[PDB]
Amino acid sequence: KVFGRCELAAAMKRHGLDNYRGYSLGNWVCAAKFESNFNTQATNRNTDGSTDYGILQINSRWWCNDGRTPGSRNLCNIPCSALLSSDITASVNCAKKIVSDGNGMNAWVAWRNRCKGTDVQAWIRGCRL
Ligand SMILES: C[N+](C)(C)CCO
Ligand SMILES: [Cl-]
Ligand code: NA
């Protein structure tokens, strides 16, 4: 599924992301925009052979099992495919574990390089929330 902007902001809020670990909703929307263009089916292979999955491009090195990332963990206890569902519940739940891991939203390099420090509220501007 490709979410609309305000559609995704609404789903994220309903699953308790808005201000989670102190990150306002625009931060999550901006990160998903640059990680996946709001497409739940987005995948991207990394140089190390791990893969990133879903709206927040969560990585198989640590967070999910895909059966093809040697030496990796599955700290969210999920198949990476669950991260590609139209229902964002597994991506949100695993994102809450990632953003709690110590480095906050710096875990997502596209958030640090394209969202951090910017006027992230613009991403939820005009949305009924
Ligand atoms: C969300 N991760 C930390 C797993 C990677 C970003 O693409
Ligand atoms: Cl933080
Ligand atoms: Na894994």
From Swiss-Prot:
Keywords: Allergen, Antimicrobial, Bacteriolytic enzyme, Disulfide bond, Glycosidase, Hydrolase, Secreted, Signal. Residues 1-129 form the C-type lysozyme domain. The keyword Repeat does not apply. Pfam families: Lys. Coiled coil: none annotated. Disulfide bonds join 6-127, 30-115, 64-80, 76-94. It catalyses: Hydrolysis of (1->4)-beta-linkages between N-acetylmuramic acid and N-acetyl-D-glucosamine residues in a peptidoglycan and between N-acetyl-D-glucosamine residues in chitodextrins. CDD domains: LYZ_C (cd16897). One of its GO terms (cellular component) is cytoplasm. SUPFAM superfamilies: Lysozyme-like. Substrate binds at residue 101. Its EC number is 3.2.1.17. In the egg white and polymorphonuclear leukocytes. It is found in: Secreted. The active site is at 35, 52. One of its GO terms (biological process) is defense response to Gram-negative bacterium. One of its GO terms (molecular function) is beta-N-acetylglucosaminidase activity. Lysozymes have primarily a bacteriolytic function; those in tissues and body fluids are associated with the monocyte-macrophage system and enhance the activity of immunoagents. Has bacteriolytic activity against M.luteus. Monomer. Lysozyme C is capable of both hydrolysis and transglycosylation; it also shows a slight esterase activity. It acts rapidly on both peptide-substituted and unsubstituted peptidoglycan, and slowly on chitin oligosaccharides. Belongs to the glycosyl hydrolase 22 family. This is Lysozyme C. The lineage of its organism: Eukaryota, Metazoa, Chordata, Craniata, Vertebrata. The gene is LYZ.
